[PDB]
């Protein structure tokens, strides 16, 4: 059985979040949690919250027994960007992008 949890419009660039996603691709949830607990990165908190939400969904809605779950799939997409202005020298102006991302996690007992 597949259970999915998502976090859309997360305030972070996709490239920075992708460094943490591959740390746990294919592991068991029990070791994925404490792997995520001891990395000093901002995106680790977001990915950990998504993973815990997925585990709770997989426990409540469908069957129980989270002792044999695995991270079957995980990937990060790109959300819409917000555009701003930053002044520069001699009267010029520059465009700033604030990128977002979508985070998806799939777990399965099988």
């Amino acid at each position: 059985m597949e259970t999915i949890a998502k976090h859309r419009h997360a305030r972070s660039s996709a490239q920075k979040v992708r460094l943490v996603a591959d740390l746990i691709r294919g592991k068991k949830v029990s070791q994925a949690l404490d792997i995520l607990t001891y990395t000093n990165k901002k995106a680790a908190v977001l990915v950990k919250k998504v993973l815990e939400s997925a585990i709770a969904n997989a426990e409540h809605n469908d069957g129980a027994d989270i002792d044999d779950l695995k991270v079957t799939k995980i990937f990060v997409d790109e959300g819409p960007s917000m555009k701003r202005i930053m002044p520069r020298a001699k009267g010029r102006a520059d465009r700033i992008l604030k990128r977002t991302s979508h985070i998806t996690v799939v777990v399965s007992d099988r």
């Binding site: 555009k83 701003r84 001699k90």
Partner: peptide, 26 residues
């Protein structure tokens, strides 16, 4: 809650000059 809005501006195209000597002057 409020929705996000963007704005923009263009320069006057200031007349910059090449203050160093000419490339192949007289």
């Amino acid at each position: 809650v409020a929705v996000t809005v963007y704005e923009a501006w263009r320069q006057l195209g200031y007349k910059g000059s090449w203050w160093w000597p000419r490339i192949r002057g007289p």
